[PDB]
Amino acid sequence: MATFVELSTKAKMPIVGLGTWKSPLGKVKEAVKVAIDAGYRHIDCAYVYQNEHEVGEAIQEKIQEKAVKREDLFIVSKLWPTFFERPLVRKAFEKTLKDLKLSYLDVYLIHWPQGFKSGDDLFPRDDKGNAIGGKATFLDAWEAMEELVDEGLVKALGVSNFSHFQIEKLLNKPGLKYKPVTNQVECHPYLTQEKLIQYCHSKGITVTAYSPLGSPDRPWAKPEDPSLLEDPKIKEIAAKHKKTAAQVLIRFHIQRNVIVIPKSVTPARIVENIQVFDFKLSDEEMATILSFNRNWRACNLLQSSHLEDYPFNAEY
Ligand SMILES: NC(=O)c1ccc[n+]([C@@H]2O[C@H](COP(=O)([O-])OP(=O)(O)OC[C@H]3O[C@@H](n4cnc5c(N)ncnc54)[C@H](OP(=O)(O)O)[C@@H]3O)[C@@H](O)[C@H]2O)c1
Ligand SMILES: COc1c(Br)c(Br)c(Br)c(Br)c1Cn1c(=O)ccn(CC(=O)O)c1=O
């Protein structure tokens, strides 16, 4: 049973959730079932993961078997930037909701701030592999997403991969109806996000930490890239508590009041990753982990740096 972080809407978002990026069909259903059995209530999904239909099946199973009630689940999905045009926001959301077999989403996020070429080519690219932009902006998207909230199809909106400049742009938009309840960004001891977390919290916006284990399975990983799970200094703190490195990496965020969404399809690891409420990292250990900051991104998306709303050029 995970604790919660209170949102500005007073909704309670479970502080540990299950990630589903790259969770294969044929394993993601069982993964979600095991997670719910283990006490997970928060599941992080996305249209672009192309597995929401199988996540939906798992959720429906557990509900109809009395393992969990819908009101106790916390389901998050994301709008992909090829769908920022108003009519496409609705169509994309409807596909997400139908796949998940749900009547509503708890949170719906703008997945990335830069608009891409509109349509169902999810990764429109040139010959070099650079993203092709679209003229519809995240503000255009937000307008259409606000309708879903008006209609009760989504309880709250949020953003992902936004810098403080972009969040400012959103918050300071004249005629804003709903405010973002979270900003989901990469966060871990190599990218501690101190300034961005400080900013978000000061605006009543929570932070959701993605790739908390450093996303070791990411396709573009090079053998020289830093590895959090094998970091001797992380492992030292784990050993001190007779816990795993993964558990330390997860507990790190909990103690900063930051939501964290580790991904696994491995039953043992799914359980392991939520066994993080029976120990505490000391003040000194937290400081030590914070000192590991390298401003290193596993998810740099250099292929889109040429587009207007590239979030990672700013300091925070
Ligand atoms: N908003 C965004 O733009 C964005 C970007 C990236 C990710 N996300 C979200 O955040 C979630 C988590 O990030 P991520 O998937 O990039 O990477 P991650 O959770 O940091 O790492 C996942 C990898 O670590 C392995 N693993 C999981 N638990 C482990 C453990 N206890 N010990 C050792 N290895 C373990 C998994 O293997 P197995 O699965 O084989 O067990 C998987 O290969 C994603 O699934 C997605 O939901 C969002
Ligand atoms: C595979 O490399 C690319 C390329 Br090329 C482009 Br263009 C984009 Br956009 C992305 Br987001 C990626 C990476 N990527 C995916 O493809 C799918 C999901 N994610 C994570 C997320 O946003 O949740 C990626 O980073």
**Three-state SS annotation for 225-270:** CCCHHHCHHHHHHHHHCCCCHHHHHHHHHHCCCCEECCECCCHHHH
| Residue bearing tokens 């908390």 | 212
**C-alpha radius of gyration, the chain, whole number:** 19
CA 23, CA 266: separation in Å to the nearest integer?
A: 10
CA–CA–CA angle 101, 107, 111 (5° rounding): 100
- Given a contact cutoff of 8 angstroms between Cβ atoms, the answer to whether 20 and 47 are in contact is no
The closest ligand to the CA of 215 turns out to be: 1
CA 261, CA 277: separation in Å to the nearest integer?
A: 15
Q: How many residues does the chain have?
A: 316
Q: Give me 72's structure tokens.
A: 């106790």
Is the shortest distance between the CB of 211 and ligand 1 below 6 Å? yes
CA 63, CA 183: separation in Å to the nearest integer?
A: 28
Tell me: is residue 99 an annotated ligand-binding position.
no
Is the shortest distance between the CB of 304 and ligand 1 below 6 Å? no
| Start-end of H helices in the chain | 28-38, 52-64, 86-100, 138-150, 164-171, 194-202, 232-240, 245-254, 267-272, 283-290
4-6 and 12-14: which strand pairing? antiparallel
| Residue bearing tokens 């979270």 | 182
**Other Cβ atoms within 10 Å of 267 Cβ, number:** 16
CA 127, CA 130: separation in Å to the nearest integer?
A: 7
How far from 23 is each of 30, 50, 261, CA to CA, in Å? 10, 10, 13
Q: Which amino acid is at 196?
A: L
Domain residue limits, the chain: 1-316
Span from the CA of 30 to the centroid of ligand 2 (angstroms): 24
CA 129, CA 304: separation in Å to the nearest integer?
A: 9
CATH of 1-316, one of 3.10.580.10, 3.30.365.10, 3.40.640.10, 3.20.20.100: 3.20.20.100
182-186 and 206-210: which strand pairing? parallel
CA 176, CA 119: separation in Å to the nearest integer?
A: 26
- Given a contact cutoff of 8 angstroms between Cβ atoms, the answer to whether 246 and 272 are in contact is yes
- Given a contact cutoff of 8 angstroms between Cβ atoms, the answer to whether 14 and 42 are in contact is yes
Helix (H, G, I), strand (E, B) or coil at 135: coil
